[PDB]
Amino acid sequence: LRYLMDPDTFTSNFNNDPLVLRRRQTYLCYEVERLDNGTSVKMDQHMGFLCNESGRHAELRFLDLVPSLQLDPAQIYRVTWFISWSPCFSWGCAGEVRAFLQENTHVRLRIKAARIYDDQGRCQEALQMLRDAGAQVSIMTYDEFEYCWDTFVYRQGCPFQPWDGLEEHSQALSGRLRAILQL
Ligand SMILES: [Cl-]
């Protein structure tokens, strides 16, 4: 988490109010944990946040920087995404992440999303495609919002202050997502 996110930037885009639908940007905070001897090893050079740049969505910009992580293909790494939009909202995004998981079987992808975009169409199919490729997808609760504020945000020792309806929004979003991925 070398460079920290602007705090006002964090609250705007990670707000989970269903009645607000901003298409401004999509932020992805990432951390890679190596799972070894009953613990999780985390390196600061494997942490940070991305957004959409050029015509490359944040989920695909993280896949690009995977070789520069110098991961060991003989060990188990768990990658976590804290993402401010529905996972793989862009076209063809779920297919690349699916292919990536098939090649790098030493990687476990865990996706914590501030919200989802239930279109009952292709965005809903993208969420199920990630599940079937092995990804573990769930809605961010107060825990995840507070953790990112402490971990990725330039807070200057200030505590996380939740916005109105954070828990109500999260549980309703959680209920819809669970119904989508239920089997
Ligand atoms: Cl969930």
PDB file of C-alpha atoms and ligand atoms in Angstrom:
ATOM      1  CA  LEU A   1       0.000   0.000   0.000  1.00  0.00           C
ATOM      2  CA  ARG A   2       2.779   2.424  -0.952  1.00  0.00           C
ATOM      3  CA  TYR A   3       0.681   5.251  -2.428  1.00  0.00           C
ATOM      4  CA  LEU A   4      -2.515   5.810  -0.455  1.00  0.00           C
ATOM      5  CA  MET A   5      -5.887   6.675  -1.946  1.00  0.00           C
ATOM      6  CA  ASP A   6      -7.417  10.105  -1.518  1.00  0.00           C
ATOM      7  CA  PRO A   7     -10.025   9.796   1.277  1.00  0.00           C
ATOM      8  CA  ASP A   8     -12.733  11.775  -0.516  1.00  0.00           C
ATOM      9  CA  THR A   9     -12.104   9.546  -3.540  1.00  0.00           C
ATOM     10  CA  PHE A  10     -12.758   6.464  -1.401  1.00  0.00           C
ATOM     11  CA  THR A  11     -16.124   7.516   0.023  1.00  0.00           C
ATOM     12  CA  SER A  12     -17.519   8.674  -3.330  1.00  0.00           C
ATOM     13  CA  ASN A  13     -16.872   5.510  -5.331  1.00  0.00           C
ATOM     14  CA  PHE A  14     -17.265   2.856  -2.620  1.00  0.00           C
ATOM     15  CA  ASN A  15     -20.610   4.263  -1.454  1.00  0.00           C
ATOM     16  CA  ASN A  16     -23.080   1.397  -1.842  1.00  0.00           C
ATOM     17  CA  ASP A  17     -26.320   3.388  -2.215  1.00  0.00           C
ATOM     18  CA  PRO A  18     -28.349   1.426  -4.818  1.00  0.00           C
ATOM     19  CA  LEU A  19     -30.153   4.635  -5.827  1.00  0.00           C
ATOM     20  CA  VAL A  20     -26.841   6.203  -6.984  1.00  0.00           C
ATOM     21  CA  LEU A  21     -25.383   4.731 -10.187  1.00  0.00           C
ATOM     22  CA  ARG A  22     -22.175   6.565 -11.079  1.00  0.00           C
ATOM     23  CA  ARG A  23     -20.250   5.339 -14.127  1.00  0.00           C
ATOM     24  CA  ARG A  24     -17.273   7.595 -13.353  1.00  0.00           C
ATOM     25  CA  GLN A  25     -14.648   5.007 -12.391  1.00  0.00           C
ATOM     26  CA  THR A  26     -14.055   1.567 -10.891  1.00  0.00           C
ATOM     27  CA  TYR A  27     -11.470   1.155  -8.135  1.00  0.00           C
ATOM     28  CA  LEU A  28      -9.778  -2.133  -7.230  1.00  0.00           C
ATOM     29  CA  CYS A  29      -7.673  -2.438  -4.075  1.00  0.00           C
ATOM     30  CA  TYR A  30      -5.594  -5.605  -4.156  1.00  0.00           C
ATOM     31  CA  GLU A  31      -3.520  -7.721  -1.798  1.00  0.00           C
ATOM     32  CA  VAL A  32      -1.720 -11.021  -2.379  1.00  0.00           C
ATOM     33  CA  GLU A  33      -1.334 -13.388   0.575  1.00  0.00           C
ATOM     34  CA  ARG A  34       0.865 -16.475   0.426  1.00  0.00           C
ATOM     35  CA  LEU A  35      -0.687 -19.272   2.499  1.00  0.00           C
ATOM     36  CA  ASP A  36       2.045 -21.136   4.362  1.00  0.00           C
ATOM     37  CA  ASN A  37       2.259 -22.966   7.707  1.00  0.00           C
ATOM     38  CA  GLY A  38      -1.055 -21.817   9.135  1.00  0.00           C
ATOM     39  CA  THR A  39      -0.636 -18.117   8.361  1.00  0.00           C
ATOM     40  CA  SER A  40      -0.857 -15.594   5.522  1.00  0.00           C
ATOM     41  CA  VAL A  41       2.277 -13.785   4.356  1.00  0.00           C
ATOM     42  CA  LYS A  42       1.545 -10.317   2.966  1.00  0.00           C
ATOM     43  CA  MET A  43       4.060  -8.026   1.245  1.00  0.00           C
ATOM     44  CA  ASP A  44       3.568  -4.273   0.918  1.00  0.00           C
ATOM     45  CA  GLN A  45       4.941  -4.426  -2.627  1.00  0.00           C
ATOM     46  CA  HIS A  46       1.953  -6.682  -3.444  1.00  0.00           C
ATOM     47  CA  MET A  47      -0.631  -4.133  -2.261  1.00  0.00           C
ATOM     48  CA  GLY A  48      -2.174  -1.058  -3.818  1.00  0.00           C
ATOM     49  CA  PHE A  49      -5.157   0.089  -5.820  1.00  0.00           C
ATOM     50  CA  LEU A  50      -5.998   0.404  -9.509  1.00  0.00           C
ATOM     51  CA  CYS A  51      -8.709   2.133 -11.511  1.00  0.00           C
ATOM     52  CA  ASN A  52      -9.824   2.010 -15.139  1.00  0.00           C
ATOM     53  CA  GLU A  53      -7.218   3.478 -17.488  1.00  0.00           C
ATOM     54  CA  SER A  54      -7.255   3.954 -21.275  1.00  0.00           C
ATOM     55  CA  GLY A  55      -9.572   1.180 -22.513  1.00  0.00           C
ATOM     56  CA  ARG A  56      -8.307  -1.377 -19.981  1.00  0.00           C
ATOM     57  CA  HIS A  57     -10.637  -2.116 -17.069  1.00  0.00           C
ATOM     58  CA  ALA A  58      -9.271  -2.343 -13.536  1.00  0.00           C
ATOM     59  CA  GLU A  59      -9.773  -6.113 -13.330  1.00  0.00           C
ATOM     60  CA  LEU A  60      -7.654  -6.592 -16.447  1.00  0.00           C
ATOM     61  CA  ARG A  61      -5.039  -4.038 -15.354  1.00  0.00           C
ATOM     62  CA  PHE A  62      -4.352  -6.192 -12.300  1.00  0.00           C
ATOM     63  CA  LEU A  63      -3.852  -9.288 -14.445  1.00  0.00           C
ATOM     64  CA  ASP A  64      -1.272  -7.343 -16.460  1.00  0.00           C
ATOM     65  CA  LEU A  65       0.919  -6.711 -13.394  1.00  0.00           C
ATOM     66  CA  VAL A  66       0.886 -10.391 -12.337  1.00  0.00           C
ATOM     67  CA  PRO A  67       4.267 -11.295 -13.937  1.00  0.00           C
ATOM     68  CA  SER A  68       5.880  -8.352 -12.111  1.00  0.00           C
ATOM     69  CA  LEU A  69       4.802  -9.952  -8.822  1.00  0.00           C
ATOM     70  CA  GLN A  70       7.320 -12.763  -9.453  1.00  0.00           C
ATOM     71  CA  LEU A  71       4.954 -15.259  -7.842  1.00  0.00           C
ATOM     72  CA  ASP A  72       6.236 -18.776  -7.235  1.00  0.00           C
ATOM     73  CA  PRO A  73       4.205 -21.336  -9.240  1.00  0.00           C
ATOM     74  CA  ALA A  74       4.985 -23.979  -6.578  1.00  0.00           C
ATOM     75  CA  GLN A  75       3.041 -22.272  -3.758  1.00  0.00           C
ATOM     76  CA  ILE A  76      -0.492 -21.107  -2.982  1.00  0.00           C
ATOM     77  CA  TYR A  77      -1.311 -17.400  -3.201  1.00  0.00           C
ATOM     78  CA  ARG A  78      -4.705 -15.927  -2.343  1.00  0.00           C
ATOM     79  CA  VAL A  79      -5.503 -12.677  -4.160  1.00  0.00           C
ATOM     80  CA  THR A  80      -8.189 -10.366  -2.769  1.00  0.00           C
ATOM     81  CA  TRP A  81     -10.030  -7.671  -4.734  1.00  0.00           C
ATOM     82  CA  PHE A  82     -11.933  -4.885  -2.964  1.00  0.00           C
ATOM     83  CA  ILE A  83     -13.826  -3.383  -5.898  1.00  0.00           C
ATOM     84  CA  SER A  84     -16.180  -0.389  -5.978  1.00  0.00           C
ATOM     85  CA  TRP A  85     -18.348  -1.629  -8.878  1.00  0.00           C
ATOM     86  CA  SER A  86     -19.958  -4.879  -9.983  1.00  0.00           C
ATOM     87  CA  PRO A  87     -17.116  -7.338 -10.720  1.00  0.00           C
ATOM     88  CA  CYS A  88     -16.327  -7.726 -14.431  1.00  0.00           C
ATOM     89  CA  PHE A  89     -18.884  -5.136 -15.540  1.00  0.00           C
ATOM     90  CA  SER A  90     -17.016  -4.559 -18.823  1.00  0.00           C
ATOM     91  CA  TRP A  91     -17.541  -6.742 -21.881  1.00  0.00           C
ATOM     92  CA  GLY A  92     -15.258  -9.764 -22.176  1.00  0.00           C
ATOM     93  CA  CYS A  93     -13.791  -9.167 -18.716  1.00  0.00           C
ATOM     94  CA  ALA A  94     -15.110 -12.402 -17.171  1.00  0.00           C
ATOM     95  CA  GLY A  95     -13.692 -14.472 -20.035  1.00  0.00           C
ATOM     96  CA  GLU A  96     -10.149 -13.214 -19.488  1.00  0.00           C
ATOM     97  CA  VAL A  97     -10.311 -13.698 -15.710  1.00  0.00           C
ATOM     98  CA  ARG A  98     -11.710 -17.185 -16.339  1.00  0.00           C
ATOM     99  CA  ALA A  99      -8.850 -18.063 -18.688  1.00  0.00           C
ATOM    100  CA  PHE A 100      -6.346 -16.569 -16.245  1.00  0.00           C
ATOM    101  CA  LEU A 101      -7.546 -18.798 -13.402  1.00  0.00           C
ATOM    102  CA  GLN A 102      -7.289 -21.875 -15.635  1.00  0.00           C
ATOM    103  CA  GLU A 103      -3.639 -21.087 -16.441  1.00  0.00           C
ATOM    104  CA  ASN A 104      -2.542 -20.010 -12.943  1.00  0.00           C
ATOM    105  CA  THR A 105      -4.019 -22.760 -10.810  1.00  0.00           C
ATOM    106  CA  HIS A 106      -1.749 -21.646  -7.934  1.00  0.00           C
ATOM    107  CA  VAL A 107      -3.926 -18.528  -7.489  1.00  0.00           C
ATOM    108  CA  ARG A 108      -7.157 -18.223  -5.501  1.00  0.00           C
ATOM    109  CA  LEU A 109      -9.187 -15.116  -6.373  1.00  0.00           C
ATOM    110  CA  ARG A 110     -11.444 -13.617  -3.685  1.00  0.00           C
ATOM    111  CA  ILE A 111     -13.653 -10.719  -4.793  1.00  0.00           C
ATOM    112  CA  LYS A 112     -15.313  -8.387  -2.270  1.00  0.00           C
ATOM    113  CA  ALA A 113     -17.603  -5.961  -4.116  1.00  0.00           C
ATOM    114  CA  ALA A 114     -19.173  -2.742  -2.862  1.00  0.00           C
ATOM    115  CA  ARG A 115     -22.219  -3.494  -5.051  1.00  0.00           C
ATOM    116  CA  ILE A 116     -23.481  -5.506  -8.015  1.00  0.00           C
ATOM    117  CA  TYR A 117     -25.363  -4.586 -11.194  1.00  0.00           C
ATOM    118  CA  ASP A 118     -28.253  -7.056 -11.447  1.00  0.00           C
ATOM    119  CA  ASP A 119     -29.354  -6.707 -15.073  1.00  0.00           C
ATOM    120  CA  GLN A 120     -30.804 -10.240 -15.243  1.00  0.00           C
ATOM    121  CA  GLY A 121     -28.562 -10.385 -18.315  1.00  0.00           C
ATOM    122  CA  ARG A 122     -24.864 -10.418 -19.172  1.00  0.00           C
ATOM    123  CA  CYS A 123     -23.591  -8.704 -16.010  1.00  0.00           C
ATOM    124  CA  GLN A 124     -25.428 -11.291 -13.912  1.00  0.00           C
ATOM    125  CA  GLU A 125     -23.928 -14.024 -16.098  1.00  0.00           C
ATOM    126  CA  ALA A 126     -20.456 -12.564 -15.516  1.00  0.00           C
ATOM    127  CA  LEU A 127     -20.866 -12.975 -11.750  1.00  0.00           C
ATOM    128  CA  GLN A 128     -21.804 -16.638 -12.195  1.00  0.00           C
ATOM    129  CA  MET A 129     -18.954 -17.144 -14.663  1.00  0.00           C
ATOM    130  CA  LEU A 130     -16.440 -15.989 -12.035  1.00  0.00           C
ATOM    131  CA  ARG A 131     -17.928 -18.404  -9.482  1.00  0.00           C
ATOM    132  CA  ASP A 132     -17.650 -21.339 -11.890  1.00  0.00           C
ATOM    133  CA  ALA A 133     -14.043 -20.404 -12.697  1.00  0.00           C
ATOM    134  CA  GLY A 134     -13.249 -20.734  -8.972  1.00  0.00           C
ATOM    135  CA  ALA A 135     -13.533 -17.135  -7.757  1.00  0.00           C
ATOM    136  CA  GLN A 136     -15.129 -16.450  -4.375  1.00  0.00           C
ATOM    137  CA  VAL A 137     -17.416 -13.419  -4.739  1.00  0.00           C
ATOM    138  CA  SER A 138     -19.206 -11.639  -1.892  1.00  0.00           C
ATOM    139  CA  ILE A 139     -20.574  -8.205  -0.958  1.00  0.00           C
ATOM    140  CA  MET A 140     -18.466  -5.853   1.161  1.00  0.00           C
ATOM    141  CA  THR A 141     -19.819  -5.355   4.683  1.00  0.00           C
ATOM    142  CA  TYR A 142     -18.798  -2.737   7.260  1.00  0.00           C
ATOM    143  CA  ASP A 143     -15.767  -4.927   7.989  1.00  0.00           C
ATOM    144  CA  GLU A 144     -14.450  -4.650   4.432  1.00  0.00           C
ATOM    145  CA  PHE A 145     -15.165  -0.919   4.184  1.00  0.00           C
ATOM    146  CA  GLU A 146     -13.362  -0.244   7.469  1.00  0.00           C
ATOM    147  CA  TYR A 147     -10.440  -2.484   6.516  1.00  0.00           C
ATOM    148  CA  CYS A 148      -9.866  -0.641   3.232  1.00  0.00           C
ATOM    149  CA  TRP A 149     -10.123   2.737   4.971  1.00  0.00           C
ATOM    150  CA  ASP A 150      -7.415   1.632   7.403  1.00  0.00           C
ATOM    151  CA  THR A 151      -5.313  -0.219   4.804  1.00  0.00           C
ATOM    152  CA  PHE A 152      -5.518   1.663   1.491  1.00  0.00           C
ATOM    153  CA  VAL A 153      -6.717   5.210   2.297  1.00  0.00           C
ATOM    154  CA  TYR A 154      -4.666   8.274   3.290  1.00  0.00           C
ATOM    155  CA  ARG A 155      -6.639   8.703   6.498  1.00  0.00           C
ATOM    156  CA  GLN A 156      -3.977  10.344   8.716  1.00  0.00           C
ATOM    157  CA  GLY A 157      -5.008   8.263  11.711  1.00  0.00           C
ATOM    158  CA  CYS A 158      -8.677   9.227  11.387  1.00  0.00           C
ATOM    159  CA  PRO A 159     -11.160   6.381  11.972  1.00  0.00           C
ATOM    160  CA  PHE A 160     -13.584   5.116   9.363  1.00  0.00           C
ATOM    161  CA  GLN A 161     -16.892   6.988   9.463  1.00  0.00           C
ATOM    162  CA  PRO A 162     -19.750   5.078   7.790  1.00  0.00           C
ATOM    163  CA  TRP A 163     -22.237   6.737   5.473  1.00  0.00           C
ATOM    164  CA  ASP A 164     -25.997   6.549   5.944  1.00  0.00           C
ATOM    165  CA  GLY A 165     -27.576   3.185   5.208  1.00  0.00           C
ATOM    166  CA  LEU A 166     -24.266   1.370   4.682  1.00  0.00           C
ATOM    167  CA  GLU A 167     -25.479  -1.770   6.450  1.00  0.00           C
ATOM    168  CA  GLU A 168     -28.981  -1.785   4.928  1.00  0.00           C
ATOM    169  CA  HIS A 169     -27.585  -1.283   1.430  1.00  0.00           C
ATOM    170  CA  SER A 170     -25.004  -4.028   1.987  1.00  0.00           C
ATOM    171  CA  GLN A 171     -27.448  -6.682   3.218  1.00  0.00           C
ATOM    172  CA  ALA A 172     -29.918  -6.117   0.370  1.00  0.00           C
ATOM    173  CA  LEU A 173     -27.072  -6.230  -2.163  1.00  0.00           C
ATOM    174  CA  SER A 174     -25.818  -9.356  -0.383  1.00  0.00           C
ATOM    175  CA  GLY A 175     -29.220 -11.034  -0.626  1.00  0.00           C
ATOM    176  CA  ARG A 176     -29.462 -10.455  -4.376  1.00  0.00           C
ATOM    177  CA  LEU A 177     -25.896 -11.607  -5.058  1.00  0.00           C
ATOM    178  CA  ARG A 178     -26.364 -14.784  -3.013  1.00  0.00           C
ATOM    179  CA  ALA A 179     -29.530 -15.652  -4.956  1.00  0.00           C
ATOM    180  CA  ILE A 180     -27.570 -15.210  -8.199  1.00  0.00           C
ATOM    181  CA  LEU A 181     -24.694 -17.490  -7.195  1.00  0.00           C
ATOM    182  CA  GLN A 182     -26.809 -19.993  -5.241  1.00  0.00           C
ATOM    183  CA  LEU A 183     -26.609 -23.629  -6.340  1.00  0.00           C
TER     184      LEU A 183
HETATM  185 CL    CL B   1     -22.481 -11.845  -0.065  1.00  0.00          CL
END
